[PDB]
């Protein structure tokens with residue numbers, strides 16, 4: 001399988017539909033081909049040449065959120081031909097600047113750019129997503145970041161102005177100058193609550209969702225329950241609610257850190273990898289510290305109330321009222337594991353497929369059955385060096401059979417399943433993996449694309465038909 | 475002497491404005507117009523709709539509070555194609571300072587039902603939406619505002635009284651400036667805020683009496699410069715009027731240092747307007763918002779400076795018959811009209827059986843009251 005290495009740790013990874021795979025390591029962005037061997041173009045954001053981390057970041061506890069220079073990498077306007085692809089590239093450089101660029105060649109010039117769009121702190125969180133809103137249905141960017149953090153020297157001081165000291169989520173107009181944010185286009189943080197660490201940002205049902213959790217960056221501990229904020233998909237901020245995520249199932253002390261986030265679009269179910277504290281070094285490790293939980297988005301929407309707890313509201317101060325409602329993650333769909341760090345979920349034939357990353361470099365795969373019940377995970381790939389997997393697992397937009405595995409300074413192109421390992425029809429269809437099927441003409445278990453199809457014959461036997469439908473069936 | 479054009483019944487006066495020499499009086503439910511001695515009335519949605527504003531944009535616009543949902547209408551009823559009202563009228567009956575220069579609207583009217591007082595510039599000919607930083611504008615709001623040139627650039631000047639609660643509750647009067655065509659911030663977050671806003675303390679002391687609460691203001695352009703008349707109130711028995719030279723004020727904003735900032739100021743000073751398209755730098759914007767007050771206090775011109783009585787709510791000026799570059803200052807209370815002669819320094823008073831609201835001078839002084847509008851002054855005696 002293909003592999004790409006960098007001199008610096010990878011901070012962000014995103015794959016364009018038609019244009020190459022974009023990867024950001026130190027202070028540079030690389031446009032790689034889908035085969036991960038040819039760098040089509042590069043972007044020296046800090047200084048021409050040297051991509052060495054202008055500074056140095058010490059990767060804390062494996063459960064603690066990491067530090068990075070790249071804060072935002074989002075390809076957009078790539079659905080169909082006629083408009084042209086655009087790319088949003090954000091960083092900690094220039095007070096958390098973000099620029100809009102032509103999706104493709106990095107040597108080209110950026111169209112618009114603005115400062116204070118993203119968190120200027122290397123360890124500060126940032127999660128953004130592009131959406132459509134307004135009369136003309138224009139493109140807007142919604143960004144949630146930890147903009148304010150305790151900083152000593154005023155020579156570097158990048159914290160936003162006093163009027164913007166409490167801003168948590170901000171809406172930007174992509175066509176507007178400096179990616180302008182309007183007066184009523186921001187959600188503010190409730191004071192004294194400490195800091196909020198945003199994990200992801202996604203669109204679902206007319207609203208934008210922001211998975212996060214209260215986090216003290218100084219002490220390195222979670223000061224609350226992991227939650228999700230909901231806002232309407234509009235030009236101005238309309239707070240719709242806040243709900244806590246409960247995934248402390250197999251753990252006696254509970255799990256307060258959300259490490260990875262993935263929305264299963266065809267299922268309307270959100271997948272999250274939760275974890276408890278690891279002592280500090282990696283002390284309190286246990287076969288129950290991390291877990292995978294699936295939440296019904298309709299339950300999140302229903303339980304998210306416009307109460308002021310982590311965010312300021314109109315007729316409520318802060319924490320002087322009702323508490324946020326908790327949401328349960330679908331029983332028996334939970335996967336308790338010792339060290340999970342990343343997740344990506346999709347629906348193949350009709351079954352829910354979940355890819356999991358671990359702290360020792362394993363890429364696991366879980367296929368849900370009847371009632372979204374979880375089976376025993378299959379190890380699809382293992383990293384030689386045992387490098388913990390990056391919290392973002394990116395699928396291949398061109399080939400459905402591939403998934404990009406990122407860890408440390410390496411990006412690999414991994415096949416979603418090992419079909420050829422099976423050498424019998426029954427032996428292969430009992431495995432119940434929607435990606436694999438018995439190809440009658442070649443007498444091998446393969447992907448749908450590896451087997452020749454014809455309308456007059458049934459050459460590729462899928463899982464839905466059953467193992468009993470094999471030619472030799474007892 | 476005084477010709478009263480009475481309404482059909484006593485009205486609650488909410489606001490009065492002058493545009494094309496036409497007096498626009500806003501009442502609870504309707505709006506009256508007055509010009510060429512004829513009174514015209516156009517009734518609007520009658521309930522608890524307080525008409526607080528009458529401005530001149532591309533057309534005459536009249537806005538009201540409705541039943542908690544601000545809306546604007548055309549002079550002769552109508553719908554208003556622009557569908558504005560949000561920042562054009564408050565949600566509750568209150569004082570308002572909204573002005574329109576050419577077609578650019580500047581207002582202190584709350585944009586939402588949840589307080590947060592700001593001085594804003596809406597999207598138009600002068601640029602897009604702009605608003606002041608947090609707590610810059612007091613809960614009392616802006617008391618007066620006008621547009622005046624400073625070089626080749628137009629600037630907006632506003633007056634307001636700030637309350638400071640450190641050890642004691644102290645009120646302080648200020649005059650602030652900003653560029654009419656100010657682009658805005660330089661970040662994404664501050665792109666819609668004023669980048670040239672500065673303020674200076676105003677002084678109006680007579681004999682130990684230090685006036686702080688601003689009531690009304692009027693700016694008159696002369697040959698040399700612009701003279702700003704400001705009437706102050708006090709929790710005691712007297713009120714007072716002080717005048718200021720706009721040239722002196724412009725000099726101060728232009729050359730005076732910033733209180734609290736001892737380091738060197740940037741090549742292009744903080745409150746200086748930039749050419750169309752140019753944006754104020756980050757280093758400059760960081761200073762201006764943290765140090766927006768000058769290390770100075772503007773002293774008033776020697777004359778005119780007079781006092782009493784407390785309770786004044788409005789005033790207007792009229793030049794004393796082209797033979798004298800002197801003036802007659804008319805100001806009012808609840809049931810009394812006053813006139814101050816700047817040459818003789820004599821003040822007269824006249825009682826009326828009406829609840830007075832304002833004095834707006836055109837060719838003759840108009841007195842807007844709950845009963846109607848009185849054209850011309852009554853026979854006054856030396857108070």
Ligand SMILES: *[C@@H]1O[C@H](CO)[C@@H](O)[C@H](O)[C@H]1NC(C)=O
Pocket residue numbers: 046047049050051052053054
């Ligand atoms: C570039 O890399 C060098 C190592 O050769 C490193 O020491 C330096 O910090 C980097 N310079 C920058 C900031 O681009």
Ligand SMILES: *[C@@H]1O[C@H](CO)[C@@H](O)[C@H](O)[C@H]1NC(C)=O
Pocket residue numbers: 109110111112113114177178
């Ligand atoms: C980046 O944007 C700023 C204004 O936001 C502009 O001054 C600068 O020229 C832009 N850079 C390029 C080359 O696009």
Ligand SMILES: *[C@@H]1O[C@H](CO)[C@@H](O)[C@H](O)[C@H]1NC(C)=O
Pocket residue numbers: 192193194216217218219220223
């Ligand atoms: C943040 O951490 C510091 C020390 O690490 C502590 O003083 C402070 O109380 C913490 N904030 C909260 C409420 O978690």
Ligand SMILES: *[C@@H]1O[C@H](CO)[C@@H](O)[C@H](O)[C@H]1NC(C)=O
Pocket residue numbers: 350351
């Ligand atoms: C699977 O697909 C069938 C159609 O073949 C549909 O009826 C069923 O609802 C789907 N099951 C789920 C919920 O995955």
Ligand SMILES: [Ca+2]
Pocket residue numbers: 264265266267268
């Ligand atoms: Ca869906």
